[model samples]
Every structure is written in C-alpha cells, then in structure tokens.
Target: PTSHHFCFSIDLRSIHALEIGFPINCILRYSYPFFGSAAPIMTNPPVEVRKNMEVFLPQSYCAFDFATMPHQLQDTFLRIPLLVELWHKDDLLLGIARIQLSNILSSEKTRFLGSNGEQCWRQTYSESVPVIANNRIADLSYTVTLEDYGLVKM
Candidate 1:
C-alpha cells in the first residue's frame, strides 16, 4: 500500500491536426520542480495530414513509476508537470500542453490505489488542453491513470 503506477497519456482523438500533409508526432516533456517523461505518435505522408485530419498515437504514453520505483518515490506527490508538443515534419511544431500532476497524486488518491487485490486501482483524468503554439484552443485532451497491483487494503 505504498507504491503505484502513474502516467500521462494522449490518445488520437485528443489531437487536432492542423496543416494538411507533412508529418505527425506527439512529444511529452515531463519534470518536477524539485524532481522529473515522453509520448511519441509518429506519422508521415502517403497519408498527408489535415487541419482536422484523422489521428493515431500508436498508444502513446508518458509514464512514471512511483511509490514503487526507488527513484520515483515522494517525487510523485510533490511537483511534476508535463509539457507536450505536437510536431509536424520534424521541422516545425504545432501545439503544446503542460500538465500539472500534484492534484492527482496527493493524499488518498494513491491511498485509493493501495492494493486490496489483483484488480487495477485506476483513475482516469481527461482535460481540454489548448495548444500553446499559434494557440487557438483546440481542446486537445490528455489522460492520467493509476494501475495498481498487490494485496492490501488501500
């Protein structure tokens, strides 16, 4: 009941692909003010992208192991933020989003995940993140989840 699984994730539906035909990838940059992440959704032409084109992140996930990994302890509930970038053609960038982590990992949250069985003690967070590029607020979304394992009352 002292460790857990955490991650910041971006699914395809949360992305807005502006500027048709180039390339695509979502990069997640994570760090804690006192502490420390990447998600890559890569694509190229043959399938030129549109301003509102279809998307796929290839299951892109930026993860952190906390309350578990020796190096990730305590840092989980302090101050970790995620800065995400949407890149096109590997030459130019499109959008960016910085995710704050404190709110999700603070007290009782992971306690809520403290394993009582083999089931996943999971939580899902979704938000409308406006890309900070030529920013127009596309409502790009991101998710966070906790995957629990072990045998104790949370």
Candidate 2:
C-alpha cells in the first residue's frame, strides 16, 4: 500500500584547506533513473580560499525522498555516487571526491525494522570527507541524517 518512499537530509558544516588563495566554487551533484534523479543539487556561490582556510557554509541542507520501487532498487540506490568538486574561477577543477550512498550510512540495516520498527530507521552521522584532485587535500565536514517514511501495514 503506501510503503515506497524514503527521505534524506544532508548538512555540509564547513570546509578547510591545506593550500590556497583563490576563490573555488563548491559543487555537489548526482541524479539517477531507477530510483529517480532530480535529486537536489547544491551549488554554493564562489568563495575564496586561503591557506589554513575554513569556510562555513550557511545551514546547508537538502531533503528528498527516493522511490523505493524495489528492494533491488533500494540496493541500486546503495551505489549512487555523490560528486563533490572544487572549481577555480568557475572554470577549472581543483579538488574532487565521490561519496557512495552506503558509506556514510553507518549501518547496513537497522534492527528495528522488525524488533524496534518505527524507532530505528532514523540515522545520523558527522563526516570529515576529503576532496582531492590536485596534490593538495581539502577537508570538508558534514552531518547527514536519513529516515525512511515507509514501512508496515502489511
């Protein structure tokens, strides 16, 4: 019956640099077909970077629900990749990283789906992801929370 949607939330806290002195645009984008693609895309205005730099983005958050048409489809969502890139003058790529959906999700499956049910689908995490395309590494911190809004009534 009405059991086929999962919601996700992401918050990018801040980004720090190992080397710098140029405005680099931060771009995050990804979309897929099986589950649905029009997934939210985040493009923050270009910000300059200086060595030992830390830029805090304002309450960066995105929320979208996936169409869980198949357990296999949910599995397909497992490999969905998030593209994080740093751009120079909006023309060049500085640093980049790929994040797999399953990686940040600490647990493969919450025991509560049956034992705890409604109490366990909510998951949260804080991550220090590294974006590197050149020799220099840019560390970015973020918090992600995901919850499935469908289950039960079977």
Candidate 3:
C-alpha cells in the first residue's frame, strides 16, 4: 500500500452548550512545510455539539495525491498537525483542539464474488459513520451565546 487512512476523534463534553454552523473549517498544518493547500470540506462535526463525551471527526476528501498532485513528497514518515476550531452561531468560538494524526492504517478490504466468479480489488472506507446521521438534523435552529470570535450575533 502507498497510502493510509487517517482518522481523528475529539471530545466536546467540556462546553455546556455548543452550536456550530454547517461546514466546519479545519486548518491542517504540515510538519515539514507547504505553500498553498486547499481546505477540505468538513461536514462531520455536529451542528449542536455538547461537552463531556467523545466525538469522532470523519473526513472523506483525499489529503495528498502523491501520484498526480505535486506539492510535497518524500520517503520519510511525517506528522501532520490539525487545528480544529469549533464555532458557535457562525463566529463564536466554542472550543479548539490541537490534534496530531499518528494512527494511520490501510483502507479496509472487501471481497465480492462476481457473476463469473472473478475477484476484484475494491477499497473501503468508513465514510458513512452512523454518528453523523444521528447528530445532524434538518430544519433545526439552535440558539447559543456568542461571547467570543468577534461576532455580533447572539
């Protein structure tokens, strides 16, 4: 294998009442260094987060395409630090977590028997975790106190 799947988990049970908007922003900081890197779309964070429990952060977007993309490449193992800021009601800072991705593993494998009895290579990922479906609700508007992050709305 040439790449490994990275997963992150954060606990938000410290805050009393947390409410974040759609599409959470996560700023990735490479250990080595990089110039321009696009921010991936984060949709796994809970819309109405709480403290005192563990929250899993799942991302589906590819981080580095070593074969096609040309930005940084090497044969040495490196660490990528992630700075995630939870925002409440658009700009209010709910909490911040500094995480370093170290637990890397190859993508899960699945076997399927074809009609003609042929085997194929198919990779699987945990992109459809049930936690996201349970937390995210449609047409739900929550009110939270905006005390930080330079915001006017409350």
Which model scores highest in lDDT? 2
lDDT of 2 by residue, 26-132 (tens): 54433444445564455466556666778876435666656454465447547666666656654766777665666545554453442224553666667787877
Give candidate 2's TM-score. 0.70
Q: In model 3, which runs have C-alpha deviations exceeding 4 angstroms? A: 1-36, 44-46, 51-64, 68-79, 105-154
- TM-score quality measure for candidate 3: 0.32
Question: Which model, 1 or 2, shows the larger lDDT?
Answer: 2
Candidate 1, residues 1-154, lDDT tens digits: the string is: 5444433333323555654344444433333432232333342232334467545444455444333552353364444555666655445666666666444454244434333344554555666566676645334555665554433336
Measured with C-alpha atoms, the lDDT of residue 16 in candidate 3 is 26
Clashes of 1: 5
- Top TM-score: which candidate number? 2
Judged by lDDT relative to the true structure, which candidate is superior, 2 or 3? 2
List the lowest-lDDT window of 10 residues for candidate 2: 108-117
For all the candidates, what are their Cα RMSDs to the real structure? 6.1, 4.6, 15.9
Model 3: pairs clashing at backbone N, Cα or C within 3 Å: 12-51, 13-51, 13-52, 14-51
Which lDDT value does model 3 have at 66?
Answer: 20
**Candidate 3 Cα lDDT to native:** 0.28
